[PDB]
Design a binder for this molecule. Structure first.
Ligand SMILES: [Mg+2]
Ligand SMILES: [Mg+2]
Ligand SMILES: [Mg+2]
Ligand SMILES: [Zn+2]
Length: 889
């Protein structure tokens, strides 16, 4: 297993100037002919010419139109094509090859593969080498001339990068299309699509140069009517990058294509973006509400790659966070602007502090720029993407809007036409930092630690107020736990957006202020503070850290009620919950360990429950925010604060706290569920697929959250509401009616009802699968068996497999069953999946990421299943590397 090291980067001894591709698709094989116009680079030292080439069947290879002989002049081991340097010319030359590949049986969904009735490529690192021979690394820039031929009846629509310069007929009912793409690009931005695609189209006119841009969104014929929202989202994306960043689309056409089989969300190939169907297709009748924000962010994301990707490429894959973190950051700015709901930012923080914090405190912990990798595909992680995005976002927080845009422009201009690194972006931002500080000696050298240092920093506070001096002090401390990546952790540049709330009236006491913590500790003093304030810390979640506010619950309640920052209100609520959770957990644990016949639990803070009631009953308050405050923190957020987590005890803890709050608020919950109906379920624009109301969807989120709370609490006659809810036109609603019906005898009745509603839409059925999979049922294991036998079967569709199993793994009581039954089940699925799709198999390992955080028994059970998976003879390199790092072996 070869390990690639970041510090070992060296430019190739070769150059690939021109790529000329002929891709001939047939019924049971695809023939690929390729001519590479190559040269010797200045870094060449007479080494062998080595191409990446995975799973290629060689018909012939040549240098300068002369066939190479195997064994004497070259060797190929199904992974690397080695051509002995004596047969490699010392000047310009042409390498040519003809290989056979088989997209029909490419179930790994990387390289060229068949998804239902569409042939599509997926090259983003390591993929292009599965189509033909290449020096498959992002610093190898080349020009592309691509011809695609296929059966005209099966594949009338042919797409690739650049301009379609020729279309022609071929004997045998075949046809061809030539695409020439003159600008240099890396091979991971290459793409080809073939199929019976239908489209929606539109024309977009750019802001400044007035260039008309053709916009096409593609899908199979059956779901072509589900393309409208994506088209609108694409329009929004282009406008935003124009309005915010001043950037126009460079080409005359942009294609979006949905395919049913896809490992991730999407890919951003130049002028041709390719999407997981679940992230491009939606309709009001056939999609849950979540799809609309999903399509918005993903379409936006892949579009924001276009301008930067056109000018600035990654030097190497260790720089992945530079393009992914930055693009997710741009995607998030976009989404917040488009949704105009505080829950957009809250949802990204919620994901980071659950999933990414878990990752960063696990043995899989890595910095956003890793020092090494075995399988590049294994580092498309929430750390690289989402912590990466937060690191990118901190630049904006530090610099402010005006100087951030200045820094961004410097980045593009300085690095236009070349490859770049994380250091290049930091340098550009440093120039803006100098300008802002009016100080040419200012620098962001320390900031680089955000790229190199793994682990989540802990930030804690102490306060002092001098009533006579009107003087307020915030003492801050930062600390990152040592891990297997760095022995000694260094202090980071931590930007702390703060406000000061007057507890007497809820007013702001100081202007916008961002504290710059650059040391292990510092004391920030504020003069002319007329009264002892309550600090509002890390507004907007201004740094990706553990926040320890050291406030009382009284102070936290006041922030929750009166603070202006949505995140700090949300965090204060979170902190109140966590204090309660840790307290009741330990009480439950102690009772269990000592086998007590009787014991006490500390009740939920009465004033806290009062505050929740207050917010819930406020008409001017946000429905989405309301849904957060009545929900306990994510289990994966909680587990970061508990050693040897007994999942049963946590389940008991959560149940007690929900019951405590419900005993007081259930009538308020029921009242709101009824009063919210009219606005939440309004059908006025149900058949207008361009009309998306994010506030309204949040009202539905609130209703469905309340309905779940009332169902679990067995509220009197709530089953009546549940049944009527099942009749709603909105899938978010009637799928909710299924999962909340779990506590009733009507479950399998609604099981069958909602299945029939879902079965005729591929994506909708997958949402139904998720709902069933997540259903709080005691017979969930039998139910999963039913799904396998009756619905899933031997599907190799990642959307199908993930939908059936992943939500189940969040079942705190059932997945973590003490017999290890759940661990065994998922391991079997992982091993089964790894046979045809290593990446998705690695995805299905996610439950095990917390293995060393559980109680000793469950650690043992999980560890056994992982070692069992590790012992599989046919285990992939992806899965092997992942499990080896996770098990610290
Ligand atoms: Mg092959
Ligand atoms: Mg969907
Ligand atoms: Mg980019
Ligand atoms: Zn991306």
């Amino acid at each position: 297993p070869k390990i690639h090291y970041r510090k070992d980067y060296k430019p190739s001894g070769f150059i690939i100037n021109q790529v000329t591709l002929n891709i001939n698709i047939h019924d049971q094989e695809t023939i690929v002919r390729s001519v590479l116009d190559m040269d010797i680079s200045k870094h060449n030292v007479g080494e062998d010419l080595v191409f990446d080439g995975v799973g290629l069947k060689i018909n012939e290879i040549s240098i300068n139109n002369k066939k190479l002989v195997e064994g004497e002049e070259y060797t190929y081991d199904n992974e690397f094509l080695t051509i002995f340097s004596k047969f490699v010319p010392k000047s310009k030359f042409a390498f040519s090859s003809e290989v056979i590949i088989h997209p029909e049986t490419n179930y790994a969904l990387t390289g060229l593969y068949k998804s239902k009735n569409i042939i599509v490529s997926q090259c983003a690192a390591t993929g292009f080498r599965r189509i033909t021979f290449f020096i498959d690394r992002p610093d190898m820039m080349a020009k592309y001339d691509v011809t695609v031929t296929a059966d005209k009846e099966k594949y009338p629509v042919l797409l690739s990068n650049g301009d379609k310069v020729n279309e022609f007929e071929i004997p045998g009912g075949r046809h061809g299309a030539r695409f020439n793409d003159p600008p240099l690009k890396p091979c991971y931005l290459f793409a080809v699509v073939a199929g019976d695609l239908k489209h929606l189209s539109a024309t977009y006119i750019t802001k400044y140069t007035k260039k008309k841009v053709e916009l096409y969104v593609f899908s199979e014929e059956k779901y072509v009517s589900k393309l409208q929202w994506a088209l609108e989202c694409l329009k929004k994306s282009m406008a935003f990058d124009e309005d915010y960043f001043g950037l126009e689309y460079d080409l005359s056409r942009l294609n979006l294509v949905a395919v049913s089989d896809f490992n991730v969300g999407a890919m951003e190939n130049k002028g041709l973006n390719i999407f997981n169907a679940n992230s491009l297709l939606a309709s009001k009748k056939n999609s849950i509400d979540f799809s609309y924000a999903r399509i918005l962010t993903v379409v936006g994301h892949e579009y924001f790659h276009q301008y930067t990707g056109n000018r600035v490429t990654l030097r190497d894959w260790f720089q992945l966070t530079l393009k992914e973190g930055l693009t997710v950051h741009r995607e998030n700015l976009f989404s917040e602007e488009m949704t105009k709901t505080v829950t957009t930012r809250l949802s990204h923080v919620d994901l980071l502090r659950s999933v990414q914090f878990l990752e960063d405190s696990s043995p899989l912990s890595h910095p956003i720029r890793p020092e090494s990798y075995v399988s590049m595909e294994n580092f498309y992680t929430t750390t690289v993407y989402d912590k990466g995005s937060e690191v990118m976002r901190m630049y904006l927080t530090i610099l402010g809007e005006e100087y951030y845009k200045k820094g961004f422009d410097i980045y593009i201009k300085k690095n236009d036409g070349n490859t770049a690194t994380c250091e290049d972006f930091n340098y550009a931002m440093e120039q803006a930092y100098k300008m802002k500080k009016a100080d040419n000696s200012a620098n962001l050298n320390q900031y680089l630690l955000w790229f190199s240092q793994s682990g989540t920093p802990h930030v804690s506070f102490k306060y002092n107020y001098d009533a006579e001096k009107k003087q307020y002090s915030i003492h801050v401390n930062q600390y990152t736990k040592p891990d297997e990546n760095q022995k000694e952790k260094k202090p980071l540049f931590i930007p702390i957006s703060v406000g000061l709330i007057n507890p007497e009236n809820g007013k702001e006491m100081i202007s916008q202020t961002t504290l710059e913590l650059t040391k292990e500790s510092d004391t920030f003093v504020f003069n002319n503070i007329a009264v002892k304030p309550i600090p509002s810390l890390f507004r907007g979640f201004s740094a990706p850290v553990y926040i320890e506010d050291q406030l009382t619950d009284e102070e936290r309640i006041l922030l929750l009620k009166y603070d202006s920052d949505a995140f700090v209100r949300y965090n204060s609520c979170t902190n109140i919950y966590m204090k309660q959770i840790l307290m009741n957990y330990n009480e439950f644990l102690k009772a269990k360990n000592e086998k007590l016949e009787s014991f006490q639990l500390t009740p939920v803070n009465a004033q806290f429950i009062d505050a929740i009631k207050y917010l819930l009953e406020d008409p001017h308050a946000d429905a989405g925010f309301k849904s957060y405050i009545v929900s306990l923190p994510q289990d994966r957020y909680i587990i970061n604060f508990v050693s040897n987590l007994d999942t049963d005890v946590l389940a008991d803890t959560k149940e007690y706290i929900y019951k405590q709050i419900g005993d007081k608020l259930n009538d308020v919950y029921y009242k709101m569920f009824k009063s919210l109906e009219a606005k939440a379920d309004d059908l006025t624009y149900f058949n207008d697929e361009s009309h998306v109301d994010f506030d309204q969807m949040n009202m539905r989120t609130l209703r469905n959250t309340l309905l779940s709370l009332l169902s679990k609490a067995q509220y009197p006659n709530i089953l009546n509401e549940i049944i009527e809810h099942s009749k709603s036109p909105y899938p978010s609603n009637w799928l909710t009616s299924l999962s909340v019906s779990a506590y009733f005898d009507k479950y399998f009745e609604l099981y069958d009802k909602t299945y029939k509603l879902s079965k005729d839409d591929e994506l909708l059925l997958q949402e139904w699968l998720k709902t069933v999979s997540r259903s709080d049922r005691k017979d969930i294991y039998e139910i999963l068996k039913k799904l396998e036998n009756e619905v899933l079967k031997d599907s190799k569709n990642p959307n199908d497999i993930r939908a059936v199993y992943l939500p189940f793994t969040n079942n705190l009581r059932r997945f973590h069953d003490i017999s290890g039954k759940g661990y065994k089940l998922i391991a079997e699925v992982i091993t089964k999946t790894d046979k045809f799709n290593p990446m998705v198999a690695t995805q299905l390992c996610e439950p095990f990421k917390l293995w060393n955080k559980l109680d000793t028994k469950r650690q043992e059970l999980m560890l056994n299943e992982m070692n069992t998976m590790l012992q599989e003879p046919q285990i992939s390199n992806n899965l092997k590397e992942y499990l080896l790092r996770l098990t610290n072996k």
